[PDB]
Each structure stands twice: as structure tokens, then as C-alpha cells.
Design an enzyme around this catalytic site. Structure first.
Site, PDB file in Angstrom:
ATOM      1  CB  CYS A  30      -0.786  -0.292   1.301  1.00 55.61           C
ATOM      2  SG  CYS A  30      -1.696   1.128   1.322  1.00 55.61           S
TER       3      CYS A  30
HETATM    4  N1  LIG Z   1      -6.310   7.831   2.801  1.00 56.68           N
HETATM    5  C1  LIG Z   1      -6.197   6.630   3.342  1.00 56.68           C
HETATM    6  C2  LIG Z   1      -6.182   5.678   2.162  1.00 56.68           C
HETATM    7  C3  LIG Z   1      -5.664   4.072   2.424  1.00 56.68           C
HETATM    8  C4  LIG Z   1      -6.225   3.319   1.863  1.00 56.68           C
HETATM    9  O1  LIG Z   1      -6.780   3.479   0.744  1.00 56.68           O
HETATM   10  N2  LIG Z   1      -5.188   1.655   1.952  1.00 56.68           N
HETATM   11  C5  LIG Z   1      -5.504   0.811   1.209  1.00 56.68           C
HETATM   12  C6  LIG Z   1      -5.113   0.403   0.466  1.00 56.68           C
HETATM   13  S1  LIG Z   1      -3.884   0.860  -0.227  1.00 56.68           S
HETATM   14  C7  LIG Z   1      -6.601   0.055   1.698  1.00 56.68           C
HETATM   15  O2  LIG Z   1      -6.971  -0.454   2.936  1.00 56.68           O
HETATM   16  N3  LIG Z   1      -8.131  -0.320   0.785  1.00 56.68           N
HETATM   17  C8  LIG Z   1      -8.790  -1.981   1.682  1.00 56.68           C
HETATM   18  C9  LIG Z   1     -10.123  -0.704   1.810  1.00 56.68           C
HETATM   19  O3  LIG Z   1     -10.621  -0.107   0.706  1.00 56.68           O
HETATM   20  O4  LIG Z   1     -11.155  -2.588   1.725  1.00 56.68           O
HETATM   21  C10 LIG Z   1      -4.539   7.163   3.612  1.00 56.68           C
HETATM   22  O5  LIG Z   1      -4.401   7.670   3.090  1.00 56.68           O
HETATM   23  O6  LIG Z   1      -4.132   6.587   4.682  1.00 56.68           O
END
Ligand SMILES: N[C@@H](CCC(=O)N[C@@H](CS)C(=O)NCC(=O)O)C(=O)O
Ligand SMILES: N[C@@H](CCC(=O)N[C@@H](CS)C(=O)NCC(=O)O)C(=O)O
Lengths: 293, 291
Positions: A30
Site C-alpha cells: 500500500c
Molecule cells: N486515505 C487513506 C487511504 C488508505 C487506503 O486506501 N488503503 C488501501 C490500501 S492501498 C486499503 O486499505 N484499502 C482497503 C479498502 O478500501 O477496503 C490514507 O491515505 O491513509
């Protein structure tokens, strides 16, 4: 969908600055979470804030821990026998209705999510723990007052058109939406290429969070985004020499950037996305993941 | 391929002008072989051509009126809707694949030959009586070079022409790796052959160049991404191949007039089993770099 745990670590606050209290849950694949790993190493916080690596193989129940979905470097939850990241969120709040995203900055004392917004976690790390650090690490600050406005300005369009842009392109399900995302992405790379011509850093001729936030996208670009997310008008290594040079200097000359970069996690996560890559095959190239200086 | 007849004086299919016709898709490298050689030999007014739609369907290759696409054409002769209609006109009991290229006989209404390696050899000599002297003299499989052409063709065919498909249509990690590594090993071998050379064999254009070209010209535009043939690209990983490729494309109009990158990319990226989103990437830009 915006992150909804947006607390800070402040003297006299809900989350008092302490050593051995706060913990990061992340996936190496990520980019948002990798921001927090990079800054954790830059600031020398390894023995102050713990880290657990979840499996890069996203599942029907979200991010699994390493015992559920084994992968080299992925770890079991040390604390609660959590099986998926959602277990942490529901432990913090059984009624939680947001997304179960990484990164998670977790408070082990009250057993809740401090903050699940990478842009705020890395800012917390600039100062919240300085009392626990040697002088040289305490002095580092990737969002200093004098440069804040300039950083915010470049962050705004990097975030919208590059950090999120690769996903807008890769997860588009129509030709029209794909093209509407990939063109502004490469226009912004053209712009970054000019900004970085003859420069080692985006802002102020020193390392800032603008560099960290760009890096996590660009390091994944040739290894995954070009193919899997169809961001292929040109590559970094062959199409953008100023960005390529900036990227390689960060990666090869600053261990915070290379030691947190796991290309096997990166490629496995993206190419296991069955809605995009139903064969689940992981391409063997590009070779190498990042060219030497 | 199961229609494997030739065009010979006194034979079943006599050499004639205006009698034989090619049915092809611009996306198909095997069919593009026949288009390239058709132009090399100046056969455009001797052997006709119909371009099918690159939008492959549940019924096979459609004609352009069935599945419109710029440059795709309706069948001029039988109101055919799909290429299978030609095969079934030729042989109602045909049980083979309904592949392009088809070298078709308008007189007896049959498939003369549906094997690209043989079609382009037919074109070396079968129609020479209808050609001006300079086109008649061209021969892309001459006796003096045959043994060397055959040697390179064998491993180019197995590991490069077929290799990209073995890699792209592999359904296991193991099978993909088993295909893609020999592909790039053979590109390494070709890179050495072509260093300081304009042609694979004999310092002249031969069918070995044509047969390699149709794969390499599709490589950066489609195979790298869609078929995961991505250890490195032609343009940035293989300078001698890249130069050879660009000299053929830019300096011999038989190779550019027959190269439709929009057809190429539309066909590959419409393959739902590999690319379910059906999105066609906008890159790489350009399809082939200039000299
Ligand atoms: N705005 C958050 C975004 C974090 C994010 O979207 N992480 C993704 C992985 S790249 C995630 O965990 N996706 C799981 C989901 O959306 O269910 C940040 O910048 O920390
Ligand atoms: N061995 C044949 C191969 C021709 C071939 O496979 N053509 C493909 C398109 S690239 C085709 O028509 N596939 C349709 C099918 O198999 O049903 C030749 O070289 O001419």
C-alpha cells in the site's frame, strides 16, 4: 471515501505522547501505508512505534494477517489474534461503518484507532515523539512552517492526479473514465519532470513530505502501475529522466526508502486483484525493479 | 491448419489474376504476414483482400458490417457475416478452426490455404507471370538461404511467434514463466544476430524478417502489457532489434501500410478472459518510435 479516525498524539490530549504505546498496522504493497513506514525510519522511531505487516494478498474479508494468508514478511497480529484488519476496527468500535483500510496508527493502551489517514500519521511523526529521539532525529521535520504553503500547493495536485490518479486509471471500468484519469496523470508527470529538472527534491532543496508522498507512487509505477493499471503512455525509467534520477537518489541513498520497499509485496498485491487480472499471474518484469545509479 | 493446397500451373488451383482473395484481420500477426508479402511482391491488383473486424466475437471473426470498426470491411462476395461462413461454404462438414488468414478461391469457392507460412511462400513465385520484372524477381525464400532461414524460423516460431501467446494465455504462474523466459532468451539471441545488421539472414530481406516482424511490431503496443511480456521492452531493452524493426517499418511501405495499431490494440484488449475491464490503454506513445 475519506478516512474517519482523525485524532492526534498531543500533550494533554486523548493520546499522550509515549514510547511503546502506539503501533502501526500496514501492508507493504500500500503506498499510503508505506508513507508511514518511510517516515518511521527517517525519524528513527523503530523502537518507539511498533509495526506489524499484514499479508499483501487482499481477501474477501479485507487485509488478512500473515497466519491467515502466509507470504514472506507478512506477520500475525501480535496482540489480539486479529485475523483481518477489520478485526482491529471493530475492536475499536463495534459499530464502525467506514472502510477497513491500512495504515492504522493504533493505541495499544485504550485499544483504538488513533488515526487512519496517512497524510496525518506522517505529520504526527514529525514532532510528537521528539522527546524520545536523539537530537539529530528530533530535528528532522518534513513539514516545516517555512515550506508548508509550498508543500500544500504541490501536494494538492500530486494527490489528486498522481497518487489517486493511478487508481482512477487502473480501477476505471469504462474507456472514457480510464482516459479521463490517465491523461491528467501523465500531464502531471510531465510537470513534475520539469519541476525536478536539475533538482534533488520537490520543495526547498531538502527532503520534505512532498517527496515521500510522490515517491510511494513513483516507485510502484514501472513495477505495477504501467502494466496492471494501464498507466503506460511511457515509463519512469525511459520517459522521465529527472523523475527517474530523483527516484533513484531517494531509493539508493536513503535506507528509509529502500528498506520499506518490498517489490514482491507490491507486485503480488496488485496482480492478485482478480477483477482486473483474473488469471492472477504476476509478470516477471520489469527487470530490474529499480535501475541502479 | 488443414487447408494446405498450393497454386501451381497444371494443378488444382491454376495461377490467375483476379481469382484468389485473402481474408484477414489486421490484428492477427499470422495474417499480417500475408498482407506484408502481398505488398512486397506487388500483388495488390492480382490477389484481393478483405479486412475483417478486429472485434473477435462469440461467432469468430465478424465482417465490418456486422461489427463496425474503421477499416473493417463487409464481405464482397457471399454476404458472409463471420469468417466461419466461408469455411462452411467451402466444406459444410469442416471441423477445424475458423482462422485468418484465408487464401480463398473465388472460382471453386474453397479455401486454398489457411497456413500463413505457406501462403507467403506461394506468393514468392506463383503469380510472377503477372508482375513487372522488379517485383517478379523478389523471392523471400531463395534456395541459397533456405537452410539458414529454416534454422532461425524454427526457434523464432516456437519461442517468439508462439511464445508471446504461450506467455499471455498461460493460466498458471509456472506456465507463464516457462514461456516468457525462453521468449526473452530468444530476443537476447536475436539482438546479437541483428547487431550491425539490417536483416536476419543473408544481408537481404527474407521471410525470416517478415515472420519475426509481425510479432515484434506488436510487442511494445500490446504484448508487454496484455500478455505480460515485460522483462524489458523492444524500444528500451533491445537496440539492435529496435533499429531493425524501425528500418523495416519506416523505410519499406509494405510493412507500414499493413500495420494498423488501432486494430492490433482493439483485438488484444477486447479479450475478456485476460482483460475483463475491456479497457484499451492509451500507451505506449508512440506505437513505434521514428528513425
Ligand atoms: N486515505 C487513506 C487511504 C488508505 C487506503 O486506501 N488503503 C488501501 C490500501 S492501498 C486499503 O486499505 N484499502 C482497503 C479498502 O478500501 O477496503 C490514507 O491515505 O491513509
Ligand atoms: N497457423 C495459422 C495460425 C492462424 C491463427 O491462429 N489466426 C488466429 C488469429 S491471430 C485466428 O484466426 N484465431 C481464431 C480461432 O482460433 O478460432 C497461420 O499461421 O496462418
Amino acid at each position: 471515501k475519506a478516512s474517519t479516525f482523525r485524532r492526534f498524539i498531543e500533550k494533554g490530549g486523548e493520546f499522550e505522547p509515549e514510547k511503546g504505546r502506539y503501533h502501526l498496522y500496514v501492508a507493504y504493497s500500500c503506498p499510503w501505508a508505506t508513507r508511514t513506514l518511510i517516515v518511521r525510519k527517517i525519524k528513527g522511531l523503530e523502537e518507539i512505534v511498533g509495526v506489524t505487516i499484514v499479508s499483501p494478498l487482499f481477501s474477501a474479508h479485507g487485509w488478512p494477517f500473515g497466519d491467515v494468508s502466509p507470504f514472506p514478511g507478512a506477520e500475525a497480529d501480535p496482540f489480539y489474534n486479529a485475523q483481518y484488519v477489520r478485526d482491529l476496527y471493530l475492536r475499536a468500535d463495534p459499530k464502525y461503518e467506514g472502510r477497513f483500510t491500512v495504515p492504522v496508527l493504533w493505541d495499544k493502551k485504550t485499544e483504538t484507532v488513533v488515526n487512519n489517514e496517512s497524510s496525518e500519521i506522517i505529520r504526527i511523526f514529525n514532532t510528537a515523539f521528539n522527546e524520545f529521539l536523539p537530537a539529530d532525529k528530533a530535528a528532522i521535520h518534513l513539514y516545516p512552517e517555512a515550506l508548508k504553503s509550498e508543500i500544500d500547493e504541490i501536494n494538492e495536485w500530486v494527490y489528486d492526479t498522481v497518487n489517486n490518479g493511478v487508481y482512477k486509471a487502473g480501477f476505471a471500468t469504462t474507456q472514457q473514465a480510464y482516459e479521463a484519469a490517465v491523461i491528467p496523470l501523465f500531464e502531471s508527470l510531465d510537470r513534475l519532470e520539469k519541476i525536478l529538472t536539475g533538482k534533488d527534491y520537490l520543495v526547498g532543496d531538502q527532503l520534505t513530505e512532498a517527496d515521500v508522498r510522490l515517491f510511494v507512487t513513483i516507485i510502484r509505477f514501472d513495477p505495477a502501475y504501467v502494466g496492471h493499471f494501464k498507466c503506460n503512455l511511457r515509463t519512469i525509467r525511459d520517459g522521465y529522466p529527472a523523475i527517474h534520477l530523483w527516484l533513484r537518489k531517494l531509493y539508493w541513498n536513503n535506507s528509509a526508502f529502500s528498506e520499506t520497499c518490498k517489490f514482491d509485496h507490491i507486485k503480488a498485491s496488485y496482480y492478485a486483484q482478480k477483477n482486473v487480472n483474473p488469471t492472477l499471474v504476476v509478470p516477471l518484469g520489469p527487470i530490474p525493479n529499480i535501475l541502479p545509479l
